[model samples]
Target: ENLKHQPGGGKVQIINKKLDLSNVQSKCGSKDNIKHVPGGGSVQIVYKPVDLSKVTSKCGSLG
Candidate 1:
């Protein structure tokens, strides 16, 4: 049952940089969140991992 429901902590701080998350996902299961500064920039994101295994296709179901 390692499906989440755990406790953790983390951090992310970036400065003077360019980022691109057009295709990003999973983060973390704690304070592991994104951060920024006056000139900072950008993962195991906080909150908790996502699970879309039983998700449907972009078109339809089992198409």
Candidate 2:
């Protein structure tokens, strides 16, 4: 029997900051999804964490 596995990954950070979207306006017919940040600000997109050891592959398989 042959089995294949796919790996999932994510990111981490030491310090994070909240996003500020106060100075945003909806000019067009789209939603006002604009965001404004200060000179020294950052944003982060959190994703679901994953495990790599849970993934496995068999021999003679194209990965």
Candidate 3:
């Protein structure tokens, strides 16, 4: 099978044409990595911006 990134949908779409639920899941995933404080300030504990491309990479194979 062929695989690559795209603006519309790539491997994450074939099995998830109408199942784009992972996008929302990423939000919580990122939020889970957030650092909390009592001063009304929060930051990333991992120090990563969680790029779009990186998220796709972290997602997984459609197989």
RMSD of each: 25.1, 21.1, 14.9
Off by over 4 Å in 1: 1-29, 38-48, 58-63
Please give the range of 10 consecutive residues that has the lowest summed lDDT in model 1.
37-46
lDDT of each: 0.52, 0.52, 0.47
For model 1, how many clashes? 11
In candidate 2, list every pair of residues with a backbone clash: none
Q: Give candidate 2 regions above 4 Å deviation.
A: 1-41, 54-63
lDDT of 2 by residue, 1-63 (tens): 435466456597477777554444445634335456558868755444333433345666564
lDDT, residue 17, model 2: 78
**Residue 31: error of model 2 in Å?**
27
In model 2, what is the error at residue 2, expressed in angstroms?
41
Q: How does candidate 1 fare on TM-score?
A: 0.22
Note the residue pairs that clash in candidate 3: none
Write down the TM-score for model 2.
0.17
